[model samples]
Target: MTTITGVVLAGGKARRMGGVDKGLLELNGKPLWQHVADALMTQLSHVVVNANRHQEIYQASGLKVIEDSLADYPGPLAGMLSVMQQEAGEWFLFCPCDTPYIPPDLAARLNHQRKDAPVVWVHDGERDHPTIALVNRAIEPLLLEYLQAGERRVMVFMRLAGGHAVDFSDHKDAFVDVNTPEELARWQ
Candidate 1:
């Protein structure tokens, strides 16, 4: 059985959202991360959250919260590396906290299309959601080397890791993420 750990990437600087913790932001009276976590929980047995700050708040909701080991918000790659090192699952499935509408079958779909590749992410037909991926734990070393070299682009790392994109066009609406107040309002 493949053990896939769901990881919510909440470690972003959120500069577009006025530097506020986007995960902590509420929608329909629920924190955004919780929504993503709930969706992940439906697909995976183990789920942990990655956040750089507001640890207590995230933990208060009964989710295992992990912080990025690298300082200065290196990006979601830093968060992914932290989970790969600290967490125990053989595979780590990741999604941004801002994407509350993440599909419940996300892990299943990605796993189905992974084939022989070490990484599998989502493509909504229009664009690729590189961060919303299922990564083999074996890629930790390559990821570490990539980050240590001061490279922070997730797409670049995905390519270097032999990643493939699983088409999520049928569930495209499930990938909408709220990145700003306007988006939040619109989604609300």
Candidate 2:
């Protein structure tokens, strides 16, 4: 098994949630991202949070908070690029911060599927979730090339870099990531 660094993807524009930092939004009493931290820490010790805004607030959560290296908020792939350059983990477990319902065994389950694939993305047996994945740190060069070539689509980049998709049909509901006010209210 690879030593994985848990990366909380909080580096989104949050346009759907009215421009607020979605990760910092309160769920019950604590921050929504806190729930993700709690769950990920249970599986791995090293955790890094990727947030473009409210870096101080996320930093207080007791994990290293990283901002995207690319300008103009290049999205989740940019966040992964930032980590790939900064962190030294053998493998990276990338997940969205808003998805507090992340499986406790996310790292283990994804890692189990990593035979020789550079990236192993999660599939709900319906659609592929490129963000919810385990990435080999060695893919940094290809990722850098993609970003440099003006390619930002994560799914496309995943496929271009020899990524494998694993089906998680049994835990389909666990992949829900709240993005809108209605979604926030429903999850809360």
Candidate 3:
């Protein structure tokens, strides 16, 4: 059995939300990252939070927290690469912390469709949720190469690595993320 690790991508610099940490933001009395971690925990036995700041608070929660290896908030791909290089597990399941409503079957569904592809992302009938994906460890070099080249386009890298998309049309709403204060208030 190939073990998988769930990585909540929370290392971005939330410029849209006024440079505040989106994952640390509250939603219904719980931290946004906690909500995402709890949801991912339901599908995988092991999960880690990828954050560049507030490491002490995140560590206090008892879940392993990792920071991006590349500085200046390169992108979500940096978080993904950090997890891939530093963490254990054959496959890494990634979901953005801003999206608290991550589908319950996210891991199972993505892993099921992974097949021989190094990457498997979600397609909600309308758009592709590239951040919510399952990435094989074998792509570490490819990812590193992409990042080293100063290319940060996630979809481009995934496609270059032969990424496959799993349909999640029924869970389209699950991909909604809280990027702005208005969006967070709406969810609240």
Candidate 4:
């Protein structure tokens, strides 16, 4: 089987929710990342958590933890790039730690849609969830070049890659990221 590693992007400083570290937030008796990990584990050879700090927190989850080399929150691009540098398989199924309610068959669904396609992801009609997508390590160099150019918008990068966008009718609350204490409380 081709090794499709699970890359959980947990490196965001939630400014929308008052700069809280949303990955560590608790949900359904486990951290938000734990929920995301559960959905990804069955499909991946291994799982990696990408964060800028508090890496030990994720390392304790029995999965490998990777930190951003940029040494700061450079956005999802930094997290995605850090994962691409690792020796994972060709495909990386990425999901942010804050997005706890991910689809059950995300990996299989993505692979099914783009059987021979280079890259693909979910689109909520208006906006693209770059953090939640399948990235091919073959194009890692292009992403690095974009990062070097100081480009941080993931939507732009995805567009340049000409990745496929799949739409789903499921309106799950997990897509509503827990970016603040208030938002976290709202979920509970």
Worst 10 residues of 2 by lDDT: 11-20
Each prediction's total of clashing residue pairs, residues at least 3 apart in sequence or on different chains, is 0, 0, 0, 0
What are the models' TM-scores? 0.93, 0.91, 0.92, 0.87
Best by TM-score: 1
| lDDT computed for candidate 2 | 0.82
Native-to-model Cα distance after best TM-score fit, residue 177 in candidate 4, in Å: 2.5
**12: Cα error in model 4, Å:** 5.3
Error of 3 at 175 (Å): 1.5
User: Order of candidates by lDDT, top first?
Assistant: 1, 3, 2, 4
lDDT of each: 0.86, 0.82, 0.85, 0.75
Quick one: best lDDT, which candidate? 1
Query: Which residue window of length 10 is worst by lDDT in model 3?
Result: 11-20
Q: Summing lDDT over every window of 10 consecutive residues in candidate 1, give the lowest-scoring window.
A: 11-20
lDDT of 1 by residue, 96-170 (tens): 989899887898889889998999999998899999999998899999998888889999889989998899999
Task: Put down candidate 2 lDDT per residue, 79-184, tens digits, no spaces.
Answer: 8888888888688988887888888878888888878898998887778889988998888988888888877888888999899898787895888878865788
Instruction: Report the lDDT tens digits of candidate 4 across residue range 40-90.
Output: 876676787886557677778788888766444367887787778865578
Alpha carbon deviation, residue 83, candidate 3 (Å): 1.1
Pairs of residues at least 3 apart in sequence or in different chains that clash in candidate 2: none
